[PDB]
A paper describes a structure:
Subsequent genome-wide association scans highlighted the crucial role of [name] as a high-capacity urate uniporter. Here, we present cryo-electron microscopy structures of human [name] in complex with urate or its inhibitor apigenin at overall resolutions of 3.5 Å and 3.3 Å, respectively.
Urate binds to the central cavity of [name]. The complex structure reveals extensive interactions between [name] and the substrate urate. Additionally, there are some van der Waals contacts from V213, E364, C210, A206 and N462. Specifically, during the simulation, N333 acts as both a proton donor (73% of the simulation time) and a proton acceptor (76% of the simulation time) for urate. Almost all the substitutions resulted in well-expressed proteins with significantly reduced ion currents in electrophysiology and decreased binding affinity in MST. In the MST results, N333A, E364A, Y327A, and W336A exhibited much lower binding affinity, with values ranging from 230.9 ± 17.1 µM to 472.4 ± 52.2 µM, 681.2 ± 126.5 µM, 1080.4 ± 250.7 µM and 1149.8 ± 141.3 µM, respectively. The superimposition revealed nearly identical backbone structures, with the only disparity observed in W336, whose side chain had to flip to avoid steric clashes while establishing a H-bond with the substrate urate. Notably, the direct hydrogen bonds are more extensive in the [name]-UA complex compared to the [name]-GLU (docking model of [name] and glucose) complex.
Author numbering: 54 to 520
The structure:
């Protein structure tokens, strides 16, 4: 009842928006190119050379990651006072402001306005990604924590699916309709602002500092459906006492701490290889990638729709596959399969003209890549980061992981069109090399984590440290 409604509202408000903004920049790409060309011509009187337009488009696409970086940097400070529901309402404010900033760009004729709107969407996505789990896991009972853990990925996948769906030439792909593609963002924000504020707040955050026992008891009774919640309250108080009994280490000392040097190196490498493995690229430039694959230009958006559908289905299947396969074998197999399928994709791209049916193997390779990602290392690191460290919720580790992820996303988004221009026929070899290198490194480094207490991994890494 209340728990399901709250989880659905929060997911549709944050992860749905993140998925939509991850997979909305590909469909209207030629129209935005034409608008950029016309605007530059009218302002300056000279045409755009293709390289300059490609650089501008890359900046427009990749500024979202810099927005996410600044959002992750600011959320740590904002959450000490704002909280969870207030932070989500501020997130809704950012979302509506950026949506209105983007959707009213063509009318005034401003591309800088579009850039700033995409930047504010980046900060919105960063705040959403850093806030939503801390609320979803908090308001959920420990019995059903895994379900709401996988919901935060199911909803990103469904947002990517609906972003692919919105952009077909019939629905929202016409010349005189592409401005509304960024105006759809209003509806999720409106529904979230209508649903969430009529729900109980996060109990632990208020029970930390303001110490409101009555409201916490009411929220726990509403969530659990019973008036006897003494055990959970006692456990929360014990956890808070344990947390305040131990000093919290910052980023500088964590980087300067030799006893977690290998841990931070491993998490940094895992995040960098996860983001340079390439899925945000295969969302951003799906139309161009499938056009370069020999598929006729009259069927690409339907191919993108199928891509989104198979992504969602792979997420749904992974939701159960994860619980039986494992963590380290699963992640290594995911990276190895991604590398092998990148090899398959590049060999069917290089020699597509040999047989007429070869260009239709690119979509099969794309589905294989997406299945290997979303049924694999796609969601493991979000639990692996907690598994590695002692507190399992270390702010320094979270900040480092977020910074690495956002910088890697920015680099990939900025450099993918350039590597395509350089290696039209073999541009996926770089991704394959990155995937295989990451697989080798994390097979030689990362040990088994599931069904292993923090003491065992701590002593294993202590003997690994050679000290
Ligand atoms: O579950 C995910 N799906 C994605 O499409 C994606 N893209 C990304 O960077 N991280 C994730 N995670």
């Amino acid at each position: 009842c209340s728990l399901l409604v709250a989880s659905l509202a929060g997911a549709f408000g944050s992860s749905f928006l993140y998925g939509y903004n991850l997979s909305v920049v590909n469909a209207p790409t030629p129209y935005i190119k034409a608008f950029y060309n016309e605007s530059w011509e009218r302002r300056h009187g000279r045409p755009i050379d293709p390289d300059t337009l490609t650089l501008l488009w890359s900046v427009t696409v990749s500024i979202f990651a810099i927005g996410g970086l600044v959002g992750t940097l600011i959320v740590k400070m904002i959450g000490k006072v704002l909280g969870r529901k207030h932070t989500l309402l501020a997130n809704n404010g950012f979302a509506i402001s950026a949506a209105l900033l983007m959707a009213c760009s063509l009318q005034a004729g401003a591309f800088e306005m579009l850039i700033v709107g995409r930047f504010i969407m980046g900060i919105d996505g960063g705040v959403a990604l850093s806030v939503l789990p801390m609320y979803l896991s908090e308001i959920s009972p420990k019995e059903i924590r895994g379900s709401l853990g996988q919901v935060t990925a199911i909803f990103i996948c469904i947002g990517v699916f609906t972003g692919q769906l919105l952009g077909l030439p019939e629905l929202l792909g016409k010349e005189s309709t592409w401005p509304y593609l960024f105006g759809v963002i209003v509806v999720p924000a409106v529904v979230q602002l209508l649903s969430l504020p009529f729900l109980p707040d996060s109990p632990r955050y208020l029970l930390l500092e303001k110490h409101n026992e009555a409201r916490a008891v009411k929220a726990f009774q509403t969530f659990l459906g019973k008036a006897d919640v003494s055990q959970e309250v006692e456990e929360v108080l014990a956890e808070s006492r344990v947390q305040r009994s131990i000093r919290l280490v910052s980023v500088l000392e964590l980087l300067r701490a030799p006893y977690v040097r290998w841990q931070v190196v491993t998490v940094i490498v895992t995040m960098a290889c996860y983001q340079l493995c390439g899925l945000n690229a295969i969302w951003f430039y799906t139309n161009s990638i499938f056009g370069k694959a020999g598929i006729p230009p009259a069927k690409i958006p339907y191919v993108t729709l199928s891509t989104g559908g198979i992504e969602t289905l792979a997420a749904v299947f992974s939701g159960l596959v994860i619980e039986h396969l494992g963590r380290r074998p699963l992640l290594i197999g995911g990276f190895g399969l991604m590398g092998l399928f990148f090899g398959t994709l590049t060999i069917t791209l290089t020699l597509q003209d040999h047989a007429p049916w070869v260009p239709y193997l690119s979509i099969v390779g794309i589905l294989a890549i997406i299945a290997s990602f979303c049924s694999g290392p796609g969601g493991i690191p979000f639990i692996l980061t907690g598994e590695f460290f002692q507190q399992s919720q270390r702010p320094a580790a979270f900040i480092i992981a977020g910074t690495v992820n956002w910088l890697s996303n920015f680099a990939v988004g900025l450099l993918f069109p350039f590597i395509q221009k350089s290696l039209d026929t073999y541009c996926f070899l770089v991704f394959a090399t990155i995937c295989i290198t990451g697989a080798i490194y994390l097979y030689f480094v990362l040990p088994e984590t599931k069904n292993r207490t923090y003491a065992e991994i701590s002593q294993a890494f202590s003997k690994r440290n050679k000290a």
